[PDB]
Design an enzyme around this catalytic site. Sequence first.
Site, short mmCIF file in Angstrom:
data_model
loop_
_atom_site.label_atom_id
_atom_site.label_comp_id
_atom_site.label_asym_id
_atom_site.label_seq_id
_atom_site.Cartn_x
_atom_site.Cartn_y
_atom_site.Cartn_z
N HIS A 64 1.14 -1.49 0.49
CA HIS A 64 -0.31 0.67 -0.55
C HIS A 64 0.89 1.42 -0.31
CE1 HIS A 64 -3.19 -2.38 0.18
NE2 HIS A 64 -2.71 -3.20 2.02
N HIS A 89 6.14 6.09 6.46
CA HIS A 89 5.90 6.03 4.76
C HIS A 89 5.27 6.93 3.85
CE1 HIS A 89 2.32 6.11 7.25
NE2 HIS A 89 1.40 6.51 5.97
N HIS A 91 2.28 8.89 0.44
CA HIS A 91 1.53 8.54 0.07
C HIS A 91 1.30 10.04 -1.58
CE1 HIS A 91 -0.86 7.14 3.32
NE2 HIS A 91 -0.30 7.75 4.07
N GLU A 102 -2.73 13.81 1.30
CA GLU A 102 -3.65 13.29 1.62
C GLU A 102 -4.75 14.75 2.09
OE1 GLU A 102 -3.43 9.93 4.28
OE2 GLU A 102 -4.09 9.12 2.50
N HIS A 115 3.75 10.96 6.25
CA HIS A 115 3.81 10.41 7.59
C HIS A 115 4.36 9.94 8.41
CE1 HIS A 115 -0.87 11.06 5.75
NE2 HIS A 115 -0.27 11.41 5.66
N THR A 196 -6.12 7.30 7.84
CA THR A 196 -6.40 7.44 6.76
C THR A 196 -6.55 6.18 5.61
OG1 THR A 196 -4.06 8.13 5.61
CG2 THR A 196 -5.23 10.03 6.47
C1 LIG Z 1 -1.04 2.03 4.89
O1 LIG Z 1 -0.74 2.52 5.58
C2 LIG Z 1 -1.66 1.56 6.43
O2 LIG Z 1 -1.06 0.78 6.99
C3 LIG Z 1 -0.85 3.20 8.26
C4 LIG Z 1 -1.17 4.31 7.65
C5 LIG Z 1 -1.06 5.64 8.69
S1 LIG Z 1 -1.31 7.13 7.97
N1 LIG Z 1 -1.37 6.94 6.25
O3 LIG Z 1 -0.34 7.59 9.11
O4 LIG Z 1 -3.39 7.25 8.67
C6 LIG Z 1 -1.50 4.91 9.61
CL1 LIG Z 1 -1.62 6.21 11.24
C7 LIG Z 1 -1.36 4.03 10.65
C8 LIG Z 1 -0.94 2.57 9.54
S2 LIG Z 1 -1.17 0.89 9.79
C9 LIG Z 1 -0.36 1.00 11.68
C10 LIG Z 1 0.59 1.19 12.04
C11 LIG Z 1 0.62 1.52 13.31
C12 LIG Z 1 0.51 -0.44 13.83
C13 LIG Z 1 -0.42 -0.48 13.42
C14 LIG Z 1 -0.54 -0.31 12.48
ZN LIG Z 2 -0.09 7.46 5.68
#
Ligand SMILES: COC(=O)c1cc(S(N)(=O)=O)c(Cl)cc1SC1CCCCC1
Ligand SMILES: [Zn+2]
Lengths: 261, 261
Positions: A64, A89, A91, A102, A115, A196
Amino acid sequence: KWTYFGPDGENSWSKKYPSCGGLLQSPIDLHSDILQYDASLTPLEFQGYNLSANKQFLLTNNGHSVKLNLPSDMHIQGLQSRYSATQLHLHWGNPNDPHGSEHTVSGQHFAAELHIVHYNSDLYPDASTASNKSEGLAVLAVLIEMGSFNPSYDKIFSHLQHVKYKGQEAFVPGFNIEELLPERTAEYYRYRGSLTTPPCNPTVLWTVFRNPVQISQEQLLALETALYCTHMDDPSPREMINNFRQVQKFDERLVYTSFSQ
Amino acid sequence: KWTYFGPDGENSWSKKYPSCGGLLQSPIDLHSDILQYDASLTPLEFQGYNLSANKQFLLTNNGHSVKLNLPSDMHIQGLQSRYSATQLHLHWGNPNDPHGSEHTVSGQHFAAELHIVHYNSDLYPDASTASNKSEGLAVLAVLIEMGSFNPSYDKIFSHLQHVKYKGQEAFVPGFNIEELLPERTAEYYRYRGSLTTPPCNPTVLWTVFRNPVQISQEQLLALETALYCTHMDDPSPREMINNFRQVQKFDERLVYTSFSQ
Ligand SMILES: COC(=O)c1cc(S(N)(=O)=O)c(Cl)cc1SC1CCCCC1
Ligand SMILES: [Zn+2]
Ligand SMILES: COC(=O)c1cc(S(N)(=O)=O)c(Cl)cc1SC1CCCCC1
Ligand SMILES: [Zn+2]
């Protein structure tokens, strides 16, 4: 399974991930009607961001995005608990339309978005546990514009050809993550929102820095053309492009700003 | 059951209405990079829009908008088929964020948006039958901004008092619906898309006029504050606000324009 395009795209996420149709969803459009200055929003301090260049950190294509694992000694000081880093990561858009942030600002997308995900390590022993608890996560968001070549972001981008497919892992030497943040980090937007991505848990304290950073057209093109959502041997490859969610309704939320004007 | 907020809001529409997660979804951002002049886009003709002042037309609050029923002798000339009118209705925001158009232009919302829905009467017997069929529907969209008082819009808005709650109905005497259209109707954006509400069928030929109309501060506030989504005797009333869909992704597609300059 979920994607950003086609039958498993964002309007369908709620079919499998109820929180994606719930309250407090991110990202959002930052615009004047919903902003309010809050003088209580004091500067964050970034501790242990200067990772040792002699150590290495795991970069992984998760289907992703591309993520870099970060050590729990790296943390933010200034929130109401310590939040320790877990991963960063990005986007982004696509070669023909490099406008894949985003968050938007007054209706406009930036080229990309970084992020840096942190979790409340005072309360929880890992980010997954934290991720379904209220204010269990704190994300820092950096808006990225097309501009000058950025040697600090290239410390990530130079390894993309080694994580092209889902599941692939590579090692990145440590570098100073603070070099990925923009100027005047004391100026930011703050709001309560969500992941997100599925499972869209409404458990994130968002900080979006006011000022963008720049990366070059060639860095964006590398980012937009290096990666696939699918495994190396998949007979129906899918390019990892346009991996951003559309902005969400702001169900009566305000966004608080650390800057007045 | 569907709404624009809470559990049954737009991210959850595709559960019960699968087309809401399919192709060709509206509304979209009309921005410069995707616009293309098409000299084939000639002026439409509005026929039968001057409704008999001696007939009356049913205004209803359907829980999602306020709609005025229109007669099938009212039609657009200039498309492949004749498209006959069926209803008009509006979309708007709320007094704290008065920016509730569905389409956006270069990322910016207008205050509100009027839709005049038509169906292909050459191919189909009625709008309901047409709505899920090829080439079924054509909608004219007018963008609305705050400005001077608009007597013609007041021909609708003066009846809002009588259709405050879901289920309620009033009669409106015929007037010239062309009076709701902006200046220089020859200037428009055109694209194939969908209903912006469930069931989201991808059967709409969109025409979005380039120029907005004006209504006064007082008329825009009346529209935002006059209506409820709920029945009169609901113990938990909900205001009818923010009844627009967020913009959808639109990639590798153009919006054609009848104007270049
Ligand atoms: C593909 O992106 C994700 O899966 C992911 C994206 C975000 S975001 N885009 O920053 O809101 C966050 Cl906060 C957590 C996760 S996964 C989360 C990371 C902490 C451990 C639990 C899984
Ligand atoms: Zn993100
Ligand atoms: C609540 O709004 C609606 O339900 C509705 C909205 C639109 S829009 N917003 O102009 O895309 C259209 Cl094209 C049709 C309908 S209902 C459709 C009218 C023709 C007969 C079948 C039902
Ligand atoms: Zn409509």
